Design an enzyme around this catalytic site. Structure first.
Site: not given
Ligand SMILES: c1ccc(CNc2c3c(nc4ccccc24)CCCC3)cc1
Ligand SMILES: *[C@@H]1O[C@H](CO)[C@@H](O[C@@H]2O[C@H](CO)[C@@H](O[C@H]3O[C@H](CO)[C@@H](O)[C@H](O[C@H]4O[C@H](CO)[C@@H](O)[C@H](O)[C@@H]4O)[C@@H]3O)[C@H](O)[C@H]2NC(C)=O)[C@H](O)[C@H]1NC(C)=O
Ligand SMILES: c1ccc(CNc2c3c(nc4ccccc24)CCCC3)cc1
Ligand SMILES: *[C@@H]1O[C@H](CO)[C@@H](O)[C@H](O)[C@H]1NC(C)=O
Ligand SMILES: *[C@@H]1O[C@H](CO)[C@@H](O)[C@H](O)[C@H]1NC(C)=O
Ligand SMILES: [Cl-]
Ligand SMILES: [Cl-]
Lengths: 537, 537
Positions: A202, A331, A444
């Site tokens: 990401s 995604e 994602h």
């Molecule tokens: C942008 C992206 C993600 C978030 C919240 N944190 C999350 C992240 C990731 N997976 C998640 C899956 C479920 C809920 C929250 C997740 C993957 C890595 C980045 C952070 C906040 C802002």
């Protein structure tokens, strides 16, 4: 001691672990910059003060100032992505996992994601114990500043004397400095400074993109893995002018007269460096407008980002670059659930009626032309199955397709056109223990565990098929870092090009064809070829 | 004699046949109008001269002046649609098949198609022997003038004194007169004059549409079956102004000074009535521009056609109408093969490359906006299978969808909205003896044999499944003509509406679901809902 290493900044002792029959030496919490506090807030990082006396590197380091997602209070699937050490501005620290061409081991460097607002290297999910042990490689990670602490961009609004007050992108400068630190200290850890790979997911993946192509840093690393994140994606870049407006709103939101920015810069900045970090950490979120449009992102600043992420590659040639990139099946579900939580439920599917499909689609793409809105809406109308669950499914695809998978596809085609050796994957396995609802599918970030090799961990609950796929996805990373090519020998995984857009399916079903071209090309030709034409009046 | 019937115009004797264990009396070649020759060319038909002495009705009648399709010389699949009796202007004759509510048998009237340029009631394929015998009903058919002989339209170009010189649509007036003739003579043949059904295919189907809704004729018949042909289809109607231009070009093409039309009408018409019919029959084809746009079609004349085929139904209410209509799987293949015969082959499929897919699509839809051209082209791009054969397949669908199936779908929705009782079918069986190539699939007009019940004919070669489907499709016709409802009892075939667009699949596979809604709705929502919106700038 058997566990002190002599770094460029001083002596540091870590701890020793025994993973998968291999001793690894784990050094966590090494400072790579001065604590960016006081007058050093918002500014570029500065190299850390050399130290005497071996520094304790056995603890986890602090996480950068950021807010906790509490949309589902208690529910663990959300909290495993929240900080697990205390938050602090004093957060610029590196971690290195080091095992027990001839001149040293390969070095893999992880950059976490989290939308340039959140995230941390200390999450268990990023533990590189298994990867280092089974890979016999060096793995490093580090915190970089997020939110307004890393991307407050006000320089255009002040005289040039004050350029370094808030230049922007300083979170990218943090990564650059931490990467330079590792290249300087690679040999001291058993690593070959010329054998480095960046990888991230990401926003971390987009940062990998930025670290590889920035003029500031171009040349140091030419081998990178970008999981579900490329700088051409909409959420991954922002104009100078937007950042300035978002920036000065945060100024006003913290009761420093942003009207005074132009005539007395020194005063307004002093005010902003006096605000409690908790206040900035909260009020920056006022400028959160719609889905997947965060108030912090890599900014076109004529410095770290000289131009737009599609005018970077007009010019340079990537004959020497090795790139591994890909996507997950769903995604967008996670983001759709969060930004429209009034309609949806993390556990059950939602039978969404036609009117509310229009209402939601028109919301997500409200800034596009209505002739694009009309075309997207038709491209995602359901006609088969029970129409309720399918509407929700189709909005999810639209989100993920437009914001992640097809931005990735386009950049992959762009890289291979300029000579890079690109390998493309698609992750489709739904983990058997996933705590999210079934309708959200392959989330994602669901693939991070597998590339890190966590299914090898026999204490974690995984199906034997899942352990196998974990072993296989980790070996893709190691072989890529080692040779620039993810493919095992006796495994066909051909190069990705616009001419032949073949990708490897990462899945636990063994009945599928794992090499595919058609499906991604059809979904993305809409976004990358057709929709550009309806925009032309 | 046991086979003379006393018609309103005089005595006529036919012949007697024994089909399926039933005696039917077959009267072919009965005149219903004066031979439209000499000063009666181009004019409305006039009722025939009463006769004395029983008229021989045992021969086939002449076919109206028209040209032979010889694109595949000798090949029988083309010639079975060519005239099988001699061509003549003297062609206005009726045929009646009469078996051996209480007041007389039902009467079904067939109107052949052939693009308003060609066609004839005398083709074996239209033999109503089996239908009458097994149906125990009366069936009639008749020639109507085609080509410029039926649709030369010049009245706007002359003073009003000369209105009846070439009013246009006189081929529709022929049908009206032949239909009125049968209603006058229904009782004389054992038929109930109030129990009439029109049915036809392609242009004949569109004519059924016209005979049911024209002010000239509205009310006489309220029960009709339209196979693959409705007046809203593009090929089925033409402006006054286009007809005038096509008309005066034919004038010039026959060396009568069309410039003189305005000042000395009488002279120019006299010239046109002096030309050998063979010459008109050839030179009318000069005005054939692109695919499926013939120089003759029902014309908006403020008389038989008072307005456009979509402003007819703004007003009237059809509570009393019973309508059976449908389509075949591959309406367009035949026309695509003929109008692009340089690319294609009646026997083998063509692997058509992308560039030549664009070249052909851009040709067919060259008069639509390029933003519609772009949208059609994307709506029919292949991504699965071997791409060569699929391109050809997709152009075929585009042709059939835009020109037949979705015009039908739209009118079906329009009729049910104004109260008609509409039943919809879809014909998907590929006849086992079809002489056309496999890629052409289920051809336009392939269903006529089955509705006429020809698979009951044990001398014709058909699979037992095909005989069954023939028996079933014929019974749909008979039950519709008898009760307004095609459905057997114990058979579900619900009404068609926009709210519930259910259609009955006519097929020989017994594993399919024969009631369906989704697939036709998805194909046609593109043409009938989406494309209207891209036209709006
Ligand atoms: C942008 C992206 C993600 C978030 C919240 N944190 C999350 C992240 C990731 N997976 C998640 C899956 C479920 C809920 C929250 C997740 C993957 C890595 C980045 C952070 C906040 C802002
Ligand atoms: C079932 O399938 C059979 C095979 O297709 C059909 O048989 C065909 O039947 C027709 C009509 O009976 C027949 O037609 C013509 O040729 C005959 C021989 O050359 C000829 O005798 C016919 O004509 C007579 O009819 C004319 C009408 O124009 C009259 O003017 C005269 O009085 C004259 O006597 C006609 O020209 C086909 O040859 C024949 N083909 C074969 C292969 O058998 C069946 O008709 C069909 N339907 C049924 C209900 O069985
Ligand atoms: C318009 C439509 C059709 C033609 C040619 N004649 C044909 C007709 C029919 N089916 C056919 C199938 C293959 C070849 C030619 C056919 C069905 C009835 C109308 C005429 C000419 C103009
Ligand atoms: C983290 O927690 C509290 C803050 O509430 C603090 O007192 C404690 O000392 C912190 N621990 C470390 C290791 O920084
Ligand atoms: C049809 O064929 C020829 C025309 O070449 C003509 O002489 C013949 O008499 C015609 N037959 C009928 C029954 O009209
Ligand atoms: Cl070993
Ligand atoms: Cl009987």
């Amino acid at each position: 001691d058997r566990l002190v290493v002599q770094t460029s900044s001083g002596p540091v002792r870590g701890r020793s672990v025994t993973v998968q029959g291999r001793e690894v030496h784990v050094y966590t919490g090494i400072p790579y910059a001065k604590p960016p506090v006081e007058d050093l807030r918002f500014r570029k990082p500065v190299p850390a003060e050399p130290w005497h006396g071996v520094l304790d590197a056995t603890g986890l380091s602090a996480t950068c100032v950021q807010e906790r997602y509490e949309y589902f209070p208690g529910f663990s699937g959300e909290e495993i992505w929240n900080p697990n050490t205390n938050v602090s501005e004093d957060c610029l620290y590196i971690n290195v996992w080091a095992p027990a061409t001839t001149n040293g081991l390969p070095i893999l460097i992880w950059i976490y994601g989290g939308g340039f607002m959140t995230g941390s290297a200390t999450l268990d999910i990023y533990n590189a114990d298994i990867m280092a042990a089974v890979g016999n490689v060096i793995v490093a990670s580090f915190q970089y500043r997020v939110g307004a602490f890393g991307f407050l961009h006000l320089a255009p609004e002040m005289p040039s004397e004050f350029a370094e007050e808030a230049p922007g992108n300083v979170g990218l400068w943090d990564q650059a400095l931490a990467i330079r630190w590792l290249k300087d200290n690679a040999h001291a850890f058993g690593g070959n400074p010329e054998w480095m790979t960046l990888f991230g997911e990401s926003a971390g993946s987009s940062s990998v993109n930025a670290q590889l192509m920035s003029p500031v840093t171009r040349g140091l690393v030419k081998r990178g893995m970008m999981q579900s994140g490329t700088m051409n994606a909409p959420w991954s870049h922002m104009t100078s002018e937007k950042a300035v407006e978002i920036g000065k709103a945060l100024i006003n939101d913290c009761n420093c007269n942003a009207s005074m920015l132009k005539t007395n810069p020194a005063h307004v900045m002093s005010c902003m460096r006096s605000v409690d970090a908790k206040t900035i950490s909260v009020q920056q979120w006022n400028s959160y407008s719609g889905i997947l449009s965060f108030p912090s992102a890599p900014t076109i600043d004529g410095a770290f980002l000289p131009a737009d992420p599609m005018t970077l590659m007009k010019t340079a040639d990537l004959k020497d670059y090795d790139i591994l990139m890909g996507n997950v099946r769903d995604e967008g579900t996670y983001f759709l659930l969060y930004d429209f939580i009034d309609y949806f439920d993390k556990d059950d599917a939602t039978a969404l009626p036609r009117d509310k499909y229009l209402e939601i689609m028109n919301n997500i793409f409200g800034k596009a032309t209505q002739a694009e809105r009309e075309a997207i809406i038709f491209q995602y109308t359901s006609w088969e199955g029970n129409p309720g669950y399918q509407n929700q499914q189709q909005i999810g695809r639209a989100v993920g397709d437009h914001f992640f998978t097809c931005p990735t596809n386009e950049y992959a085609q762009a890289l291979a056109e300029r000579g890079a050796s690109v390998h493309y994957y698609y992750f489709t396995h739904r983990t058997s223990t996933s705590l999210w609802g079934e309708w959200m599918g392959v989330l994602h970030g669901d693939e991070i565990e597998y590339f890190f090799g966590q299914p090898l961990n026999n204490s974690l609950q995984y199906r034997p098929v899942e352990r196998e796929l974990g072993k296989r996805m980790l070996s893709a990373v190691i072989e890529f870092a080692k040779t620039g090519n993810p493919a095992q020998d006796g495994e066909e995984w051909p190069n990705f090009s616009k001419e032949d857009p073949v990708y490897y399916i990462f899945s636990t079903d063994d009945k599928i064809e794992k090499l595919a071209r058609g499906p991604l090309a059809a979904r993305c030709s809409f976004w990358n070829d057709y929709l550009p034409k309806v925009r032309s009046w």
